[PDB]
Amino acid sequence: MAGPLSGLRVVELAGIGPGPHAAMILGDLGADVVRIDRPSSVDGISRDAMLRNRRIVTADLKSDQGLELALKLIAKADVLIEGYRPGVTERLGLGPEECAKVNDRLIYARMTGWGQTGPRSQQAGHDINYISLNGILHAIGRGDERPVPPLNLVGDFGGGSMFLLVGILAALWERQSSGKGQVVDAAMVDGSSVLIQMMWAMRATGMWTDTRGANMLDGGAPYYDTYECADGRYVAVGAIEPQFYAAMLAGLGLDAAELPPQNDRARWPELRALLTEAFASHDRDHWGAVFANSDACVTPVLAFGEVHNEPHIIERNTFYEANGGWQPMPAPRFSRTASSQPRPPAATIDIEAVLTDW
Amino acid sequence: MAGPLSGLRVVELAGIGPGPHAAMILGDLGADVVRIDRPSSGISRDAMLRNRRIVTADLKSDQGLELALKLIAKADVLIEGYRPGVTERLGLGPEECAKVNDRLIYARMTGWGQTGPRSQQAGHDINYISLNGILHAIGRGDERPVPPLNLVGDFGGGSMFLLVGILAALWERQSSGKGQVVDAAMVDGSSVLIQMMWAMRATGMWTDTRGANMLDGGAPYYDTYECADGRYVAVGAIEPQFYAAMLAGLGLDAAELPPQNDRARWPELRALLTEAFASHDRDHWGAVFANSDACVTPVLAFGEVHNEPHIIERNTFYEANGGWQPMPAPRFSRTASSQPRPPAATIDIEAVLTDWD
Numbered sequence: 001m002a003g004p005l006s007g008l009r010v011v012e013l014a015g016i017g018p019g020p021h022a023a024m025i026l027g028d029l030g031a032d033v034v035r036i037d038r039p040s041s042v043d044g045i046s047r048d049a050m051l052r053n054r055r056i057v058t059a060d061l062k063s064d065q066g067l068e069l070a071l072k073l074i075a076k077a078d079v080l081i082e083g084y085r086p087g088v089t090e091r092l093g094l095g096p097e098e099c100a101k102v103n104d105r106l107i108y109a110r111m112t113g114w115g116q117t118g119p120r121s122q123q124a125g126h127d128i129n130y131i132s133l134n135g136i137l138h139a140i141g142r143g144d145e146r147p148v149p150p151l152n153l154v155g156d157f158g159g160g161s162m163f164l165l166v167g168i169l170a171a172l173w174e175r176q177s178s179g180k181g182q183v184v185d186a187a188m189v190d191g192s193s194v195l196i197q198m199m200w201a202m203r204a205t206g207m208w209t210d211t212r213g214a215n216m217l218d219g220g221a222p223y224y225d226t227y228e229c230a231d232g233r234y235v236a237v238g239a240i241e242p243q244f245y246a247a248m249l250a251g252l253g254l255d256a257a258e259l260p261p262q263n264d265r266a267r268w269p270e271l272r273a274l275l276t277e278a279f280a281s282h283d284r285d286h287w288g289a290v291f292a293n294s295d296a297c298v299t300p301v302l303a304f305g306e307v308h309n310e311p312h313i314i315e316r317n318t319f320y321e322a323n324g325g326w327q328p329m330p331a332p333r334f335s336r337t338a339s340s341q342p343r344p345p346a347a348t349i350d351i352e353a354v355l356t357d358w
Numbered sequence: 359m360a361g362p363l364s365g366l367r368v369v370e371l372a373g374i375g376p377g378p379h380a381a382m383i384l385g386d387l388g389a390d391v392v393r394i395d396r397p398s399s400g401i402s403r404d405a406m407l408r409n410r411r412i413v414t415a416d417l418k419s420d421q422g423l424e425l426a427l428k429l430i431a432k433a434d435v436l437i438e439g440y441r442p443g444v445t446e447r448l449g450l451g452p453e454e455c456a457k458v459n460d461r462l463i464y465a466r467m468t469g470w471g472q473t474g475p476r477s478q479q480a481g482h483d484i485n486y487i488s489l490n491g492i493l494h495a496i497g498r499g500d501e502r503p504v505p506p507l508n509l510v511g512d513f514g515g516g517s518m519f520l521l522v523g524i525l526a527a528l529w530e531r532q533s534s535g536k537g538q539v540v541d542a543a544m545v546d547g548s549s550v551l552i553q554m555m556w557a558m559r560a561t562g563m564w565t566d567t568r569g570a571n572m573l574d575g576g577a578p579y580y581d582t583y584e585c586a587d588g589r590y591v592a593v594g595a596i597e598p599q600f601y602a603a604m605l606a607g608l609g610l611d612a613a614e615l616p617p618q619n620d621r622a623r624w625p626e627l628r629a630l631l632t633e634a635f636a637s638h639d640r641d642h643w644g645a646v647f648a649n650s651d652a653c654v655t656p657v658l659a660f661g662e663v664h665n666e667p668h669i670i671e672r673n674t675f676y677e678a679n680g681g682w683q684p685m686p687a688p689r690f691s692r693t694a695s696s697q698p699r700p701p702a703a704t705i706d707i708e709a710v711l712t713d714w715d
């Protein structure tokens with residue numbers, strides 16, 4: 001099995017969102033990932049590409065046999081991932097204390113939104129709820145409108161799965177000294193708060209307000225925002241540093257003498273009006289030619305369906321095909337122990353066959 | 359040093375955005391983090407530089423480089439976030455570093471990657487997510503896309519994939535005795551970060567139309583709503599039973615409403631939910647739905663977060679200097695991280711060297 005996590009053995013109690021995204025990445029990087037679903041949802045070969053790099057097995061964990069088979073896998077594994085409400089694994093007999101009795105090397109990885117304790121710990125939720133409570137959602141979107149969710153990117157994945165992964169891998173490093181596993185408590189409300197540490201830093205020093213649409217990186221700066229072009233498509237401008245901004249103005253045909261200063265915020269209305277009219281006078285792909293190879297920090301805003309035609313995407317193999325759709329290749333990349341292309345979701349397997357193999 | 363990464367040694371060449379963020383999280387979890395900045399630069403007021411020692415050094419001088427390679431020889435990980443070719447010309451490239459330490463994890467944090475047509479282009483978060491479909495998908499349908507701050511390229515698809523790479527490569531080192539190079543590009547990371555949308559598009563469950571999807575704000579049951587006081591709630595009631603619970607708490611009879619997932623009637627459903635949420639203030643709904651599975655939460659501004667019980671009681675934040683900062687994540691039962699040490703003035707690079715033998 002290819003990649004730097006070759007050898008690593010992972011048990012995943014089937015959930016939704018961050019739990020499987022984490023499991024996928026471990027898979028992506030060479031880990032041996034075994035997913036226990038419930039047969040209650042059996043079916044044929046899954047069409048969810050997030051379940052790549054897996055072996056799937058069914059097992060009614062509510063039964064005595066289910067529980068014991070599961071506990072044999074955990075016994076022989078390095079990592080467990082579960083993303084159910086607190087108390088679910090305990091009451092199933094798969095809690096941390098029950099796992100520590102059959103394998104004190106286990107990394108016990110607990111993926112939730114609200115955490116293991118506190119008032120909201122039994123409330124159902126999704127990404128949008130977790131980022132609503134810690135200031136993040138409020139900061140996303142235009143100033144003249146209600147906040148808009150950044151898909152489920154910030155809570156489920158950036159602040160969720162990815163902190164789970166770091167916790168797992170940090171704990172595997174720990175286990176090299178101590179010879180013991182431990183419990184990783186990854187809460188989306190905490191992880192996403194560390195994801196936005198920069199804004200908490202800038203806020204402390206007067207450089208970020210709570211006003212939506214009025215900061216350097218939320219769309220309030222005319223030099224860090226998207227612009228509509230003549231064809232109704234969009235470019236992104238990220239020309240923060242004055243040298244890059246100067247390069248952008250030159251490409252737009254605007255002389256600096258005629259514009260307000262780049263960071264005179266009181267005249268950002270004028271500046272935006274000027275840049276807006278300039279970008280609107282040619283089409284996205286024009287701006288794409290003008291600015292390729294430039295430090296102007298102007299890029300086309302591509303839709304998913306167009307990404308496969310972008311030279312830089314094609315050449316670094318950021319994507320692969322698998323069943324009428326592109327999918328991202330593992331990240332990050334490794335010089336000596338390279339990941340390989342993901343294997344598609346495999347038809348189910350017998351939980352015994354797996355214990356054998358292991 | 360408290361945390362699971364006690365005894366990890368990390369050298370950080372100072373940059374902006376992802377590299378410093380990764381270095382911070384490494385520090386957070388108890389790594390020994392030494393940050394080389396350039397003298398052209400007392401105490402730094404960027405709290406992102408917590409859990410570090412800062413040293414200066416002209417990496418262009420002969421003596422700055424020599425000192426630097428003596429750190430790197432003593433360390434486990436090096437982090438750099440410059441354009442490709444830069445460390446090479448300093449004589450700090452992966453090959454020069456492998457001579458003084460073949461165990462080093464050499465961690466390269468870029469936006470566009472190490473090679474290819476855009477590899478020398480300047481850029482920021484908004485550019486990396488523009489190229490791979492992400493930015494286009496964020497915002498209302500009747501408007502131009504809105505950047506999700508720099509959360510998705512710099513951090514989610516950036517620093518966090520550098521970390522996964524640094525730590526996976528440490529695992530691999532345990533069985534091979536050898537370091538290696540980690541190439542973390544924000545355009546790659548952020549694509550994996552959004553793998554769920556690519557999965558969903560492949561099965562016809564996501565479109566390229568902005569504002570018309572389950573999770574982009576087009577669903578009336580996954581969106582924010584303005585309340586009587588001008589403040590907002592978030593609704594995330596995807597599962598039908600959570601949805602049902604929400605409708606009951608709004609005073610809405612499900613018989614009067616279009617189906618939850620009849621997309622042609624979403625405009626109409628949204629208008630009914632909009633009127634309901636508008637008839638009371640945010641804190642009213644916060645109360646009403648506490649302990650509920652309705653998936654309705656108040657949308658708090660940064661300055662209100664210190665007053666939310668769930669936040670206070672889990673110590674998600676600590677007070678520092680100007681204000682609150684996020685405590686380390688994730689959390690560890692046995693080897694628990696400690697409260698971050700503030701950014702502490704420059705020390706001399708030789709001091710560190712004696713400290714590390």
Ligand SMILES: C[C@H](C(=O)SCCNC(=O)CCNC(=O)[C@H](O)C(C)(C)COP(=O)(O)OP(=O)(O)OC[C@@H]1O[C@@H](n2cnc3c(N)ncnc32)[C@H](O)[C@@H]1OP(=O)(O)O)c1cccc(Oc2ccccc2)c1
Nearest residue numbers: 016017037038060061062084085112113124125126127152
């Ligand atoms: C964008 C969006 C997201 O944000 S992702 C999810 C975000 N939240 C979390 O993950 C945080 C922690 N988890 C939970 O808070 C809950 O999981 C729950 C999901 C809220 C509700 O779940 P609920 O149904 O109450 O389940 P529970 O966890 O409390 O307990 C369920 C248990 O089931 C039983 N059993 C588990 N495994 C087995 C087994 N093998 N055999 C037998 N029983 C099993 C346990 O007994 C327990 O049940 P109990 O005893 O209490 O009755 C998001 C992301 C991705 C997808 C998505 O939705 C879509 C759906 C379809 C298509 C597309 C998207 C939404």
Ligand SMILES: C[C@H](C(=O)SCCNC(=O)CCNC(=O)[C@H](O)C(C)(C)COP(=O)(O)OP(=O)(O)OC[C@@H]1O[C@@H](n2cnc3c(N)ncnc32)[C@H](O)[C@@H]1OP(=O)(O)O)c1cccc(Oc2ccccc2)c1
Nearest residue numbers: 374375395396415416417440441468469480481482483508
């Ligand atoms: C939201 C936002 C973000 O997205 S942050 C993410 C930005 N993107 C990346 O990080 C990707 C990789 N890096 C780059 O693409 C470039 O680094 C560059 C950032 C374009 C700047 O290009 P440039 O200034 O030309 O620098 P370079 O990398 O090409 O090489 C410069 C080098 O400086 C020299 N030297 C380094 N260390 C030393 C030393 N110790 N002593 C002496 N010299 C040193 C190197 O030798 C090299 O020089 P060369 O030989 O080539 O001349 C974001 C987040 C946070 C902040 C922010 O914006 C601000 C910007 C300014 C002020 C405040 C905020 C933006």
